[PDB]
Symmetry: D2
Subunit: 315 residues, 4 copies
């Protein structure tokens, strides 16, 4: 139409509401350019003119440094933090997973991009330490799901806002404003293929869902295998998504900073819940930028059910 | 690329080996066009001003009438068969599902298109009864996956070929030729929430997958909920896919003619297997165009293992 | 919509009207794939990952050989004719200009693709001689204009049909059916920058248009500089387009087979006129496949005016 | 490309050298989005269900209001100025022509978008009078050509930069940096059909172009009829472009503020010239926002030669 409400307009508007400097708007525009390019790359993965995780990491990194908004960056496919050139520093710390779960291009890719944005609190010259914040300090968080439509979900204080990429103009158009997740769902999501390294809490919760004690309808099961896809489904349809310990640690597999914290934040801003079993995910204070966390997230009543089973039939 | 290998070029060149008439190529270009339109519609599902399955059915039906290659069409969202006007009548019979597994305008849509192509054999006037052919007689069959890339998997007598949609030119490009599924996989795919209603064969097989007897690694679980995505993953990665039986589905939920048979055909054509427990899906002779059938398909050793269990009638 | 009338449908329909073998339909599908690829290339000429005339020639050539419809091909950027592999011969001779007027990619390209299709009359093994036909024998002719929209204009016996490329699905959609050009126009098109190697006929006609003897409104002047653009404008708006002798020969500059004949044919099928001054363009029998012809084409009354000035105030 | 040079990145990086506020970047992203939407609309001009100039005006106006960077907007298809609501009010004044030279739904459309960006200088409340600034004070100016590729020519204090639209990602990419027009050209551009009404200066210059005195080669003629295309050709190839005076235009047809001034600014910024015969276009001080002005612009030696003739007041 003639009054197209794009992502950049939306961020500019709640940012004018917030009397801010618009540095975050530059940051999110850079992210959007990276996401559009990654989307069109995944488009045509099997027409090789690969290395897609590396190329996505580089693309995101350069756009963020060129945003004039970031000063410390953290990546899944990079080892320690990267201190943005003083020539182009900003007030923001970004932890991101450029690309998650891919590299069988020739007939299949299932991918998404996760990010979280914290403001820099200290006044020291920046280092790794500035990215070591608890997830409750996030200024913004979100993901881009590369599916049958390229979609950006973005969480801020007003809540969670839906965006779909319009290929005809190459802009993200807002779809849903103030997204809320259902109180209780009908779908659970976890890799049951393990099932033998599980906590008895995980087993008894799954059993409650497969053989309901009220003789009610059993929960449907869904597990795409790429995190962002499962989490997005759990945000749209309602339900619970589970990645517990499973022969890794009492700390799970997904990384806290760039995979668990942004999802926890989107979930919380949509009204859902996100725990590790012991403490809420957003309350974990990290000590390594690459440290893993167990994650049980989703609809509030379903996560409360899991926490009851953890309180009684677990350990 | 000055030597683009398009799907139309592909059918046109494997069809001169068989000394055909050229009607299959016209039919497949018609499906090509219909699928491309559907994929863009899915592109902008929340941007473009619902009812995607009836629009998809009408579009596919129209393009198939205009190919001058069909006489009988059968569609999932249409009750009885449609008999092509004689001015537009070819020799083929198409059993197709335009769209399967979608409908959310807030955000997520996950869907594909399935088709199988018979040749009319009887000298009667064309009618519904000419669709009731065993899957072993399919001339060609396959599916379009509307995922992060739009993909056409086409199976014929010589085998299975993978086609990606280059969105810059609007044609489908050959990616993998003569695809073959692994003999043994490490992924099992089914809706375990229905585990109440499993007859004991499936439960034995699945507990064997999670708790292997020979101390080898367990299988990972994967289940998207859209058949096209799940069968595509089974083909691309190897494994097994199950949708056998519930209390709400004594016969199974999937439809033999336009869902079970095309996937089973692509499967045996990729070196894999596809059973109902009792008989191979391709050897089933249908009696209603909408009749249902249980399906277990995938890598040969996995389907054979499930069949070992099934024939044993174990605990 | 759900009844999209594409180029392939249209050619299939007037081809079923003509009881033909559909070999021409294969030919035009191959042409369309070449045109879509060329269009997307010109799209992004200044994002070099050039040689565009060579690459366009190769693309068109390979698609035509892979159409199973052609046996002799002629190109602007190729020296003699190319005899299609017997493995993939057809009944048709194609003379084409793959690309006309380009190669300043870095900030500007103005281009189109011309083609004419004659049926092979003789029964000799094919050679250059089969492309040496007068333009009145054309079975099909047309052009693709690469502008603010990619457009294919196609002339056959029913007349001239308009087609625009829909990027969202990558198919050409019919726009105008049975195009006719105005009886008399208001625009003339020729490179007045020469003006000193002109025939007195050309000068007095141009003067009649600039200083009208009836004190009527003078003709507007338009000269894009790329032939297909000027000819398309002359087909849409009405007028006259001129390329006479001009220090080259009494035979002009544009090549007869692939630039002058197809335009003459499109013009004639739209109701306009196309002359060399002496004989009608479509009546010239060529003796070299690369021979030049003067060309005055456009609306019938405007070309008749030119021919009156040629009959009286010329030589 | 992992280091994409976008237009937004470009403005954002040449704006930190000047220690600006960032409002120009927001304004130019707004124009970026509006132009991309317009270019797709033009894409499908005959496919998509007229009135492109009012739609273009409304779209550009809306995106400029939403940038929070403008206070006064002036548009060719709008009578008096528009004063931006204070909640959306920036410091800049934009004089723009959304669309110029189009409207055929059968087929051809040939058009561009022009803009020039002033800074409000007076301490009055914003109003129409703040648009009446001499072109020598433009902060930035340029045009979008909607041709065979969509192109944005942006001129600022440092010079002129060329941007192409990559349609796969929906951003504008830097192609040529610091463009410079040739000193002397071989192409003259004007509507010679109006030759009746030429005051003798133009006729002398043009007869000098066709019949050079020093036995050197004559200039080629080029005239598209859309100003943006013609001025783009003049810049890219070198030459001269004329639209001075008719009997239906004692002042000329072109509009100073949104047509003449942006092109003249891009021109002097590319090392070229732009006059009215009497004065440089950039040094003209306007009195009506819709006032007209004659223009002669292009390569410096060609405009200087025309000025030699003009000052001589020759035959
Ligand atoms: Mg990861
Ligand atoms: Mg179905
Ligand atoms: Mg040529
Ligand atoms: Mg205008």
């Amino acid at each position: 139409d003639t009054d197209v409400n794009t992502l950049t307009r939306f961020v500019m508007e709640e940012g004018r509401k917030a009397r801010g400097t618009g540095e975050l708007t530059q940051l999110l525009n850079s992210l959007c350019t990276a996401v559009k390019a990654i989307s069109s790359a995944v488009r045509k993965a099997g027409i090789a003119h690969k290395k897609l995780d590396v190329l996505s990491n580089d693309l995101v990194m350069n756009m963020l440094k060129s945003s004039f908004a970031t000063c410390v960056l953290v990546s899944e496919e990079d080892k320690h933090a990267i201190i943005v050139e003083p020539e182009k520093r900003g007030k923001y710390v970004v932890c991101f997973d450029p690309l998650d779960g891919s590299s069988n291009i020739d007939c299949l890719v299932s991918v998404g991009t996760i990010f979280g944005i914290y403001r820099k609190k200290s006044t020291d010259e920046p280092s790794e330490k500035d990215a070591l914040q608890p997830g409750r300090n996030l200024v913004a968080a979100g993901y881009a799901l590369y599916g049958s439509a390229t979609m950006l979900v973005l969480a801020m204080d007003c809540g969670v806002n839906c965006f779909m990429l319009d290929p005809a103009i190459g802009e993200f158009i807002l779809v849903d404003k103030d997204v809320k997740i259902k109180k209780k769902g009908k779908i659970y999501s976890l890799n049951e293929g393990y099932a033998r390294d599980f906590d008895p809490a995980v087993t008894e919760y799954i059993q409650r869902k497969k053989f309901p004690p009220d003789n009610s309808a059993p929960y449907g099961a869904r597990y795409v295998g790429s995190m962002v896809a499962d989490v997005h489904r759990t945000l749209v349809y309602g339900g619970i998504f589970l990645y517990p310990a499973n022969k890794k640690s009492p700390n799970g597999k997904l990384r806290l900073l760039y995979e668990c914290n942004p999802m926890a934040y989107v979930m919380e801003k949509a009204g859902g819940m996100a725990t590790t079993g012991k403490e809420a995910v957003l309350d974990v204070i990290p000590t390594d930028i690459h440290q893993r966390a167990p994650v049980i997230l989703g609809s509030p009543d379903d996560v409360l059910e899991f926490l009851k089973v953890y309180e009684k039939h677990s350990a």
